[PDB]
Subunit: 63 residues, 6 copies
Amino acid sequence: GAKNVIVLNAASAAGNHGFFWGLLVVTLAWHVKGRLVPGATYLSLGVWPLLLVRLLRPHRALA
Amino acid sequence: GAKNVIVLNAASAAGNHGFFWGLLVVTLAWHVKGRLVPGATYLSLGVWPLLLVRLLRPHRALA
Amino acid sequence: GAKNVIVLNAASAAGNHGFFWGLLVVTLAWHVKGRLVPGATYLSLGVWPLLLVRLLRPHRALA
Amino acid sequence: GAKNVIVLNAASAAGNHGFFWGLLVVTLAWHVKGRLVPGATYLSLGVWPLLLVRLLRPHRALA
Amino acid sequence: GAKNVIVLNAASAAGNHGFFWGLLVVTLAWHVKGRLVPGATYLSLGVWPLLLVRLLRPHRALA
Amino acid sequence: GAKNVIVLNAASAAGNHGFFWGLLVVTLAWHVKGRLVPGATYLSLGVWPLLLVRLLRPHRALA
């Protein structure tokens, strides 16, 4: 009653692998290249987003 | 040390805690309804898929 | 080796700690707003979905 | 296989750490900016949606 | 708090488990069926992108 | 108790165990092939990304 829980997780890790799966992460990052430039332009965003963050900002482990 | 580490993970959980976040799961589930029926159509792919599955089927865990 | 593992996970948690990351999750939830209403209207999949769920319903950590 | 299962998880964390991969997360968060304003429109969403949320509301960590 | 940190994670897991949520996973998989066939057809990228992937292939865990 | 929290996670892993799920990961990887080449051709920044990563670069798992 121990190595039968975490072990299951281990199986998932094998599935992800680094071959085909590795390619997917790299490819996605490259594609957003063009996406990145339009995204950059945007005014009126000084603290408006931060207020939402304020809820997040205190944080609490023992939530 | 042993602590602080796991504690940090808990903080992430706090971030998740947000009624808005909960709402997102429901919307995705409802939308897929329509997606599901077209998917069922068994066009040209009776056994072709399964060969790929064989690689997946062992589900190694040694990694 | 012992702490040179869980500690590594903790480092990932620090990475999450970013206002930008927090903003993305909240934003995604809001977007599905419009998506949610069409999903509601369908009227179908009465008993057809549940049968599949039956396999899923017992669930088990053994796997 | 004591220190082997947890170790595997650590390896996954290494995979996440990257240059190109990091850029994608930041870009996506700011970009959704535009998506957020349309989302705000509360067209017939006063409280009706919440009833569905009630199912989600108990949560129950017992699972 | 020993049994409070990990416990928080468990709560998240319970939330993931459900009826509507289960449906989402199956539908997404079925839908990509048709998506998969066009993907297969792609000229070039047979033996050239892999070299970049090679850097990823050794992988590590000493992150 | 001790063997209960982690046990819940194991249950999630069982859910993944599904050939259909396996199909989705491979499909996504194949599709991005085409996405990868357009990404390669864009603009010449060179300094725009590194500045962002630089903030990330010191790292502080002591979050």
